[PDB]
Amino acid sequence: ANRATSAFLDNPHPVGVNYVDEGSRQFVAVAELLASKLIDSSRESDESNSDVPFVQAYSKFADDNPRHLRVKTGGKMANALTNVIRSYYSINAPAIVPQVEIDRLASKATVSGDMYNSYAIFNSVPIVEVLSPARTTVSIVGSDRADVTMLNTGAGAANITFNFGQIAETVILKGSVPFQLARLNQPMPAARFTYKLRPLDGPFIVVLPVGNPLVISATAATRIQVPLAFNKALVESGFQTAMNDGLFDIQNVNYYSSFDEFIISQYHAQDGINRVSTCVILGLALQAYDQMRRALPVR
Amino acid sequence: ANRATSAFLDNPHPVGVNYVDEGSRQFVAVAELLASKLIDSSRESDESNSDVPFVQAYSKFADDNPRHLRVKTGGKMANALTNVIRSYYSINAPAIVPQVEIDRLASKATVSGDMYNSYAIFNSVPIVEVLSPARTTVSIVGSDRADVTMLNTGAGAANITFNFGQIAETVILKGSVPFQLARLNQPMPAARFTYKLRPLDGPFIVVLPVGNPLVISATAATRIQVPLAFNKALVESGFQTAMNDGLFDIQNVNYYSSFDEFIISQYHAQDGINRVSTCVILGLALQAYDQMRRALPV
Amino acid sequence: ANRATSAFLDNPHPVGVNYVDEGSRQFVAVAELLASKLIDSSRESDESNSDVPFVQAYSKFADDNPRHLRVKTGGKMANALTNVIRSYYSINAPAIVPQVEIDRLASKATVSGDMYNSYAIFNSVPIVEVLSPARTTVSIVGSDRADVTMLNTGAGAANITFNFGQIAETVILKGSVPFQLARLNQPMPAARFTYKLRPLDGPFIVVLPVGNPLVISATAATRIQVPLAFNKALVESGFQTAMNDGLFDIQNVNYYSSFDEFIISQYHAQDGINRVSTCVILGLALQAYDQMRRALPV
């Protein structure tokens, strides 16, 4: 038998175990709230032709008055946020932010550190394993939409087993041509273009007839608890920014194309319920990072 | 001859025929407006230290003062909104909420029931049919971006016909290698990497040379009249939540990966214009469902 | 040997050289600010059951009061915004808007017009060249996610060269099966699923074993300086709207699936840093076009 698995699900590196208490969670929420004020003040400065709104918001964020000839980087708050982000990603990243600094910054604004008020939908498709017989070939590409190409060269029809895990809520399967899919020890239905599946139902068997290849497109949706301030567009932009600046360049870590891939990969690993809590705080931190750098750019 | 078609275009199920009157359209418009204020009152409450902005927003929405030790479901508005989404999806789903209840909830805010003032752009690619000769293999994968992989094992070049329907406004064709495409009974131009086509022009013929396979990637844009409050980001999130919450589970229905696939499939059915009108009202209700459920997770 | 290149990177057409000065930049920023207020005022009018907020917004944008028997077109500002969008796309566009008209429209509000206050991340993946030896077939499909399918027919393993250009900041490579990749004159590492690459670090060599095809999925991120009001969601909607309205229909031009592909393709052209500044102003104008046309459909 041959086994094929999704690339992004393979070997999730351990996430950090620091800065996950209530005090640190308050600091991340405070940074996100203050970063949003920073980006709005810069818009107001443009519309009013006056630097007062921006200097006003930068002082709260950086605890310092902007001075000419000195580069505006965000002050001590930017230093803490950038280094805390690195620790969340990997356990090999050092913890270098003192507790006195976290407590001081968390007191700047009043806000809750709650990270389970709301929910969000993530579209990464988990294909844990695809088991195929000897005379068949199976290829899996894509994360948001997974295309599984299957070719049968044997004499008769073959059965391919699909395992979508236990975490995803719904999986929608669309085929290039009508195909038959059923659960284990269940009679096969008539050929259909689309299938709506529950991953908890069990392994799924697909009949692959001899002839032209059959391509199955998979889309998945999962629910993860997130704070109300979560914004998927802002989190994804921050993830690419953190990658470009090199904050995620740590030894023995795995790289993902999107935050959707990163959070799903950690969810499907062992002790994934504990990992996903740390990833949520990282997403809020990346949202603050994205808004901070867009307000204060460097060429 | 072989025929290949897009999967999401096959067999669109009938949509509901209830809750499409002026009073019902007002209720959906009211629900979207009051649910939006619920999501904004949560942010304002967190910025300050008072729950007053949320209490006012919840009291208007749910007709009841929020209390601790209670789930905060959303009141009768949440129940009524959930049932109308079920009715819109299929004609088999029962219509539960009475018209009197709909009218009472529509009077909570003064908003217009017009659902066709603005427009929106939908990017699902409607490849209705691809007709190929005997010795050619054609495969179609994808909905947002449709990739057509064709291979010619014959002695000579083969002509492949592409039919994109009549609803899409523009279709952009990109090839792995430059290829020749022209309309029916028209000369072929020089090989080009990209083509911009209007599907109403007619079926198109692609020359498939003998050798390595040629892959064509298709992207489309169709404009559909929607209310001004329409937001594609919110509608798609509500569609996934609707399917996850199991209110689209009705006998003899078709399931889709996104709301965009759902609306384009109905547009290409028999009564396309009438079907799309109901789906647009479903889109606004889903937008209200997403905002309400994110503020009040049960 | 064979060479494979991305479809959207081929032959970027020259862009316009007009309405790129400080006075014209302010006008585009003024249009975006006033178009946003049109959308907000329409929402306020619907909620308050009064047309007074919309009348003020339309009067500021169109210099005339709305009328029931006259079509709401946006006035002279709408015509000027439409014409500058045509000019930005191609050098062959007329570019007939007077300087006196542009200057008077930039005085309606005070904005800096600076197009370098912020940055945006573009996701198009630029594969300039994939060089493959004999008995190997390589196909490139897609722009936002590039899938490279390679088959080795020959007797032994083949080396395939990948060129991602010198503009993209980072590139992530993911494979269907573990594969070996290394820079020129570097030892090959153990096979693994994911590689993170810096495009400036020379061409990359991929070892292709004989047997089943290997598919590589590529994602890239590039940062381009944009004004603070830039919104990728609204720019994308405007780009699709402009194509359907015929604003980009000029002779000897290239068409793209998205504004992401348009800006990256012009960046990679010879002396492409000249064009990237004009493309950003075009994106801001399309952001104003989307909001204005959604509020005032024609």
Add this chain to the structure above:
Amino acid sequence: TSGSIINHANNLNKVINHVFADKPLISETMLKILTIDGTTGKDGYRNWLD
């Protein structure tokens, strides 16, 4: 912000001066309720409007 507080305080005084000028907008019955604690009619109305 100081600007918002200063703007609100000045606007509040301007409205109160105008409503109580000539024939007062609010009746004597309301003023009796607002002045029951000893405060002036103008002061009582200004707090309630706030």
Add this chain to the structure above:
Amino acid sequence: FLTNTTYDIVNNDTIDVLKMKLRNQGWPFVERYNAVEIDMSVEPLRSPGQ
């Protein structure tokens, strides 16, 4: 005053102990309240702003 004791008796009592004694008697005002910071700006005019 309220619990009928003397300073010498309650000299060594801590804040939490003192809070419990007053709360049991029925006195709720046993907490300090943080002030709200109001952001202020001086318009530049001839000099740079503050």
Add this chain to the structure above:
Amino acid sequence: MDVLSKGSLKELLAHLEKTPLEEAISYRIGTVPYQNVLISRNEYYNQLYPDTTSLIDGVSREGQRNVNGLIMSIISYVVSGSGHYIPNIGFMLLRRSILDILTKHDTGLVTNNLNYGIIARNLTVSKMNCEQRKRMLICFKLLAYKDGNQNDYEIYLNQNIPLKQIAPNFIPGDMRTVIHNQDQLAIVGIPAYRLTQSTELSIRDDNAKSYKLGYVDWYNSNSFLRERSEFNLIRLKDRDTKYGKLNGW
């Protein structure tokens, strides 16, 4: 912060008498001590800034469960403001004061096998500043007097010339020596120079500046005790006295 503010031998030993051992121990996981890492310093460089983590940083680290880790956690608290992660020590040991652990046999902790050279090397004495080395030498002398290892302490000072010059002069059993001592042991304080809200490159320097800036805020905070204005409101037991003597001294 409070431990770093003490500037005289009398204040330092007085603080250690009233401070339990649980303040030295930290309950945060931290990271492994000796690692070559890359940190982000965006105020100065675009690239990541190499550095090596250490036990005398201001951030908690993971510590060995042996007695050596406990003493090394006490010294790091005195010189850096934070300790290490050594859990499940026990209620009996944690409730004792820091001075009792360092000076008294009744605690039940045996520390006569400790090597001052190995402890100093593990604490990176080379990276310590003058005040930090003086504070650590105070801890060594108290341990030597507890174990009757006065001769060994003197020989260790003879081997290390820089340590002998700055070695504080006090007999760990006589209070008269502590009062006379005039060595300045403050690490944080009111700065005479210009102190700005700017970052530092290394982990140690950046973490130290956080305490320095925090102390300024603490100095003007309501939690700070102003002896000049509120001396009568202080309790008599903890009020400052000229004839202040540590128990048994």
